[model samples]
Target: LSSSLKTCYKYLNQTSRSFAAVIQALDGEMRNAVCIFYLVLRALDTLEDDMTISVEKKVPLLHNFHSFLYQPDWRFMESKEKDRQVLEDFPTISLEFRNLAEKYQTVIADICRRMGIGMAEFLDKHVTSEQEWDKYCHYVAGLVGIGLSRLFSASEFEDPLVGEDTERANSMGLFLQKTNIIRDYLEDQQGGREFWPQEVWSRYVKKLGDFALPENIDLAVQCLNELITNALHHIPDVITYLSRLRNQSVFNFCAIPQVMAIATLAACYNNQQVFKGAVLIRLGQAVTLMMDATNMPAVKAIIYQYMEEIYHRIPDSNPSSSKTRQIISTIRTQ
Candidate 1:
């Protein structure tokens, strides 16, 4: 078990700096375990989000994701619901994920158990309002925050009471997910996926189905911009969480991706051309964003400049823009 666990950790460390940095910063056996657990969760997420599969297949897969997390022999690729292409090529991906599940079954099972508990409680008994959606995000991602807290405690790397950081961590994950939703709007639409709430879409774009129409381009863009702005409201919360990290590796690990995400958003916001083109920051730009984020004065000045730039581009009278400014003001006060 230990040897297999190490192999899984090695793969995670090599593939993801963000995950590896956190583990290294924590510095103990639990690091590898946590990384493995995260990898399993991400694998499940990939299965859920891959739209090439039919809904019937996807639904059953999601339903059995917890079982797959614990049981090694389960056949994920053999499901008829999986995309035919994925199944045809399943030997490679299947072996990789199975190895991951087997290597860290214990840790992955624990996380899945907790997430399943939260999901059942929320999904089965609760109303499905926007606030409920927020709770759902927290259950899935925020609970991961709480799990990380317990893992950090068990590793004896930080004060166990750091569990209080769960709220901020949850907000950070929510922010990232929201950013993804906005950025991938067109792609999701192309795949017949719709994640944005109907309420928001209806208010912003009269015909939610017109997302791809050239005539509806401005409305689609505006709605997406608003969602991104809403997501950015959580940035200061994330920054607060980063500030409390005494470990340098942990701090950088958490901070870097977020800063890059903001930079990506900035690039997307001001240039409609970039948005239409599905603009993404290159490695060179990411390196620069990191440097700016690490330099104290420069980081503050750049963030302020970006905020102002975003504000200028958005109409002053726009409600969504105003809400974004209000959120920013709240962050400043905090």
Candidate 2:
């Protein structure tokens, strides 16, 4: 591996050990490309998650990320007060984040530029309804999927099958992001952030703002069930995407975390206690998932079984519920 790629791997392994393990198991070429891709994605994510910074401040920083990437000696533009404090305390592997920002400047810049354009033009401008919001997530997460597809195609360990199956790649990325959005609901709310669209929240709550109230637990759960169901529409695509991975290490690397995430979602859905406390697959469970996902056919079977099980659980609480029926119908139709 190039020194830069080595640095990227070291950073991933150091900061996110489990994720790093999966990445490490990938073929050398894939390990390098995915690591670089993840680093750039993480940088964007860091900016997005920094709630203490106003959108005004964040927009400028995001716009300038490209400049920072190109200029090797560049310093990060500091935020004020609470945002600065938060960033300061945020755990990082090392200064490699800055190095990554500088090292892969062009690639990082392009991703942020595309993300900014997509968010402003497609998502914020077009999203006027709940269905639109779900579509918006597809733009955000789906594009990443497309990017990864390209990366896989361009890499030494390229999958010709993936090139022929773009929809699955898009859906896999969407599924991961949707899962993330649902999982982080409480934390996002606590951080004074909200991504739940007004139209969707309005259906369940007397008012949109009621989403923050304890009285809206049923509503919140119902909304979450709908979100997860909408998310599953992409699973077939994800499974197809996985089936194309001819490399066992690469297959396991991608499949494990995804299955683990699905399992966590399954275990947590509509279980108020699980959602109340973040639903995480324990390390032991993750190990089991890793083993199961190593066999491609087994992984496919597990995902299908889990998706159906979760789907069934949704309607049990409210069989006639609009969100529940909508989700179930989506799975059936799609």
Candidate 3:
């Protein structure tokens, strides 16, 4: 690696703990390209997250962000305190992006362009329906899965999934992104961002934050379970997606987070800790799973274990109780 690339890697490690860990599982030939792709998207995400930037400035900037990849020295300075470094130091990500193979570059650029437009479209409007939510996620995240599959194909280290069957590739990103959205409910709201689709949440509570109230606890828990059940539906698709991986790093890159996602959902389900505060898996368990998800069967075992927890925890009176149990059993048999 070049000295500058080494510096960029250092920034990645500092900025994102989970991505830094899984990204290293990629082969040397594809590692830099994948890492740079993540950083490029992350930088654009930071721009969206940074409320300091006005809509007038941010929308155009977001729409044009993919073009900025072709201009390494371009910089935007108006992001908030938390993401300021990501925006200020974006040239490093762009520099790394420019060095990737043209095929890799095209996929990265295409996703960025689409995500930029999607983000700008949703930046002002409250997402009103499940379809809108899915569409928004496709722009911001599902495209990411497509891009990664493309990169994996272009690298020739593993099977290229997006090209073979686009449906499976879409699932890969949707599952992970939905897991993340489910987990970060409070944080996202605290930042003036609302990603949870209104169609789901509106059934239980009038407003998103009302779920956090002690008086509405039962309603919130039911809503949360319903959301979790919807997330469970993505499992079978991801299993089909992961089952075909031929590369160890590629498998780990895909499998580890999926295991952790189900596990985190298991911890969050019926726990009520999520509405009270943050919810996640034990860090020790996460590390062990990350180290051990080397094959399909092992990853399946992990998923079954976590789903078992959810199965056992399903409350008889919860609104989505039957649906939750049904989804778990169906995933296991499939």
Candidate 4:
């Protein structure tokens, strides 16, 4: 790697701890492509996530963030966010982006451009409907899946058909995104951010944040189960997407997160703690998944196990019980 490329990876390691290891594990120039792709989006996401920045300033930056990839001198020194270095030292990142093969450059820039627009649209809005929930997750996470699929095919490390299956690629992202929305209710709520759709939560409580009250525990668990059921519908698509990977490194990159999503959903299923606190899978469980999720069969087995755990947790009285059970059974037979 050249000096600028090495510094880009350094920025990646500093900004993202969980993803750094897997991204660096990718093969060939794909590693650099994905690493830069991640940082570009991470920088854009950081800008969007920073509440202190006014929407007027944030929207334009997000909209034009991809353009910064070509401007060698662009940098923002005013960001107070922890990941501000990506913005403060934007020139180093843009330099590396300019060095990538034209094919990779085109793909990353296109996604960044589109995702920035999507992020801007939701800047002042709330997730109010089920379809809108899917739309929001699609913009934020599903687009990432589509972009990764394109990168995988661009590198000739996977079948071209993989990128063409946009629907399944989208499901792969929605599954993870929705799982996060579910597991992060407390944090998001406490942080003054609301991602849980009004359509789902409105049925059970007065406000989404009201799910935290002690008296609301029963309804809170039901609401949580319903969202879990909504997220489970994406599993079939994840299986279809994962089954097509021909490269081990790419497979590891894709498979590990899907498994983690399932395990996290299981931990959050019918659990009241989600409203009381964050619901995360155990450290040992994560390490075991990291080790065991290396092959397709192992991935399938782990997914099946978690789906079963979710199945047993379904309360007959819960509004979504039948649907949840049916989804689990469908995944089991796949």
In order of appearance, the predictions have TM-scores of 0.74, 0.77, 0.94, 0.96
The residue-by-residue lDDT of candidate 3 on 222-305, one tens digit each, is 877888898888899889888988888888888888887878888888777776679857533553455467788877777777
Off by more than 4 A, model 1 = 1-26, 50-64, 67-69, 79-110, 114-129, 270-275, 282-305
* Ranking, TM-score, top scorer first: 4, 3, 2, 1
lDDT winner between 1 and 2, please give it: 2
Tell me the tens digit of each residue's lDDT in model 4 across 271-324. 988988877684234534565888888788788878877898788888998899
Candidate 3: worst 10 consecutive residues by lDDT?
A: 282-291
Tell me how many clashing residue pairs each candidate has: 1, 1, 0, 0
How good is model 2 by TM-score? 0.77
Taking the tens digit of each residue's C-alpha lDDT, what string does model 1 give over 1-334? 5555545555566445555665655455555556656666655555555656666566566666667643445445543432333333333333444454233444355666566555445322432345655676675676676666556555555565555567776887776666666677677667666657666677766655577777777777777677667677777776666566554444455566666666667766735543355776532334345555554344445555556556667776555877877766775566
lDDT of 2: 0.61
The list of candidate 2 runs beyond 4 A from truth reads 1-7, 14-18, 51-54, 77-109, 119-128, 160-165, 206-209, 280-291, 316-334
Which model, 2 or 3, shows the larger lDDT? Answer: 3
lDDT of 2 by residue, 197-284 (tens): 6666667876444655777777777777666665666666676678777767767766876887787677667656433667755323
Name the top lDDT candidate. 4
The stretch of ten residues in a row with the least summed lDDT in candidate 1 is 81-90
Q: What is candidate 1's CA lDDT for residue 286?
A: 43
- Residue pairs clashing in model 1 are 57-81
Best by TM-score: 4
**In model 1, what is the error at residue 317, expressed in angstroms?**
3.8
After aligning candidate 1 to the native by TM-score, how far in Å is the CA of 58 from where it should be? 5.4
Model 4 stretches with alpha carbons more than 4 Å out: 282-291
List pairs with backbone clashes in candidate 2.
168-237
Better of 1 and 3 by TM-score: 3
**TM-score of model 3 (CA atoms):** 0.94
